[PDB]
Write a protein that binds this ligand. Structure first.
Ligand SMILES: CC(=O)CC(=O)NCc1ccc(C)cc1
Lengths: 237, 300
């Protein structure tokens, strides 16, 4: 059934699984019309599909042309997400196809289940965790490739850079979700923390900076301060 | 007007004849039911006084033979049987009638209730849902499970209703995933009506038979089937206008007959609220919506 705190180590076992997050698929700016009415303008989006064990990110870019002439876009976006996930699975070799797919929002269950009827042995699961994957567009290089797309495109990343050389996938996922939770609660502060020291760079082939183990503990600590901070600035505590 | 005689009534039992029911005491001098309208299927059903568990019964059509009831003390139930000797049967019934030991099927002349509940129900289709080919009549009880229930265990005693499943490859055309899930018209009209049922009469017949088993015997899988068949119509954007009009009439009389006490367990809140207020056909069931709102406004 649903994925929660109690079965959390299941993410890092050897059964292939994927998280699918659809928050950033349908993205709009809301603005005023010359006549003083309101209108939306779509911008490029992305499906965030992630193997939590390996760090492999299948970033399907959703170009605004896919909404042209379509109605009820928020609903369509869930079915479009499900169509693209199903296409991704069929494109993988059998031994690489996931055994489970965990959706971060329950409204993706039925669309994905229907698109995956051909794969009755792939379990489609919800989760009770409040995962911060919406903040993926606060990662500069991911945001940059989505916004520059002129056509539908799939781009492959490792969201853990080279971390798994030094840490386990449980620890790497915990670092990722802490970075993303921080970027989500206070993006400016989060990014200040990450780039404050000009001597620590982001390698061309990476998404995050090249921190030593000690600098990662400093960084991780600063992000927890931010999240507690903002949690006080918010609730006044 | 046909007759279903009883050999005897050795055990105290509540006897039902379609919507009507009466009580028979242990070893009371009861020899059956007379004046049964020809032209309709019927159901004779029972509930033992001692064990209200297992309401059961027999679907039958007097045009297809001479039937009677006889208690079996070994299997512990009232059994329907066929009498093949026509002169024996006439002589039995005439004696019991002459001694006035039969209740009269108590139909009010104005009353079309049974016709309206069984309009599309045929014995030949009942006998393909309930498979026991050596008898002309069909046994149903509270506990029997459906083919689809068994997929999710004795196959000989199953209710073989038409499997309906909205998240199935039968229901969803490759490449029409969102279209077909949100508008079930292709599943209703092509797959089910044209392909499986052949016409809307056979569809409505199964729907009506499922409701009647659900209401009379509290058969849970029958209730699931009745709701699925309603929901498939209501969730279709394109339904023949005559089907919608007939559906409204069908459901109206089901809700009108369904005793007030059974609604708790039988009616599925989600299906009814979706059908009357959210679905494509939300505006097409005027009679059904009016009686639902005036009888069961709590459900909604
Ligand atoms: C033998 C018998 O009739 C027992 C019984 O109470 N069955 C349920 C039932 C009966 C009649 C209607 C109209 C609805 C439900």
């Amino acid at each position: 059934g649903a994925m929660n705190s109690s079965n959390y180590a299941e993410l890092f076992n050897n059964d292939i699984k994927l998280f699918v997050d659809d928050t950033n698929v349908y993205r709009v700016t809301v603005h005023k019309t010359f006549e003083g009415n309101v209108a939306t303008k779509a911008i490029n989006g992305c499906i965030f599909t992630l193997n939590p064990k390996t760090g492999h990110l299948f970033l399907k870019i959703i170009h605004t042309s896919v909404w042209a002439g379509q109605k009820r876009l928020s609903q369509l976006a869930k079915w479009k997400t499900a169509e693209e996930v199903s296409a991704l699975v069929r494109s993988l070799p059998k031994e690489e196809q996931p055994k489970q797919i965990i959706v971060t929002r329950k409204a993706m269950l039925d669309p994905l289940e229907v698109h995956m009827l051909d794969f009755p042995n792939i379990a489609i699961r919800p989760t009770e965790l409040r995962l911060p994957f919406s903040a993926a567009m606060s990662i500069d290089k991911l945001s940059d490739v989505v916004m520059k797309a002129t056509e539908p495109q799939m781009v492959l990343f490792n969201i853990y850079d080279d971390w798994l050389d030094r840490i386990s996938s449980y620890t790497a996922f915990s670092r990722l979700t802490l970075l993303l939770r921080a970027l989500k609660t206070n993006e400016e502060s989060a990014k200040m923390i990450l780039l404050s020291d000009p001597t620590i760079t982001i390698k061309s082939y990476h998404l995050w900076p090249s921190f030593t183990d000690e600098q990662w503990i400093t960084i991780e600590s600063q992000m927890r301060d931010l999240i507690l901070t903002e949690y006080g600035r918010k609730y006044n505590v | 007007m046909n007759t279903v005689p009883f050999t005897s009534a050795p055990i105290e039992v509540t006897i039902g004849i379609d919507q009507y029911s009466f009580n028979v005491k242990e070893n009371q001098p009861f020899h059956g039911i007379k004046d049964i309208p020809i032209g309709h299927v019927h159901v004779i059903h029972f509930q033992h006084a001692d064990n209200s568990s297992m309401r059961y019964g027999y679907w039958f059509d007097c045009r297809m033979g001479n039937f009677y009831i006889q208690y079996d003390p070994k299997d512990g139930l009232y059994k329907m049987m066929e009498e093949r000797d026509g002169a024996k049967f006439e002589n039995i019934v005439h004696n019991f009638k002459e001694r006035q030991m039969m209740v009269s099927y108590p139909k009010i002349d104005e009353d079309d209730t049974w016709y309206n509940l069984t309009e599309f129900v045929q014995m030949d289709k009942i006998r393909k849902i309930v498979r026991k080919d050596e008898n002309q009549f069909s046994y149903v009880d509270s506990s029997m499970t459906t083919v689809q229930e068994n997929e999710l265990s004795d196959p000989a005693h199953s209710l073989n209703y038409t499997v309906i499943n909205f998240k199935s490859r039968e229901a969803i055309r490759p490449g029409h995933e969102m279209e077909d899930f949100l508008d079930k018209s292709y599943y209703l009209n092509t797959v089910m009506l044209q392909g499986i049922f052949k016409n809307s009469s056979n569809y409505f017949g199964e729907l009506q038979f499922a409701f009647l088993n659900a209401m009379f015997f509290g058969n849970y899988g029958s209730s699931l089937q009745w709701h699925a068949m309603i929901e498939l119509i209501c969730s279709s954007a394109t339904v023949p206008k005559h089907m919608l009009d007939k559906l409204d009439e069908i459901l109206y009389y089901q809700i009108k007959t369904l005793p007030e006490q059974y609604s708790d367990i039988l009616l599925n809140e989600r299906v009814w609220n979706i059908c009357l207020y959210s679905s494509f056909q939300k505006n097409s069931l005027h009679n059904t919506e009016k009686i639902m709102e005036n009888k069961y406004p709590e459900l909604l």
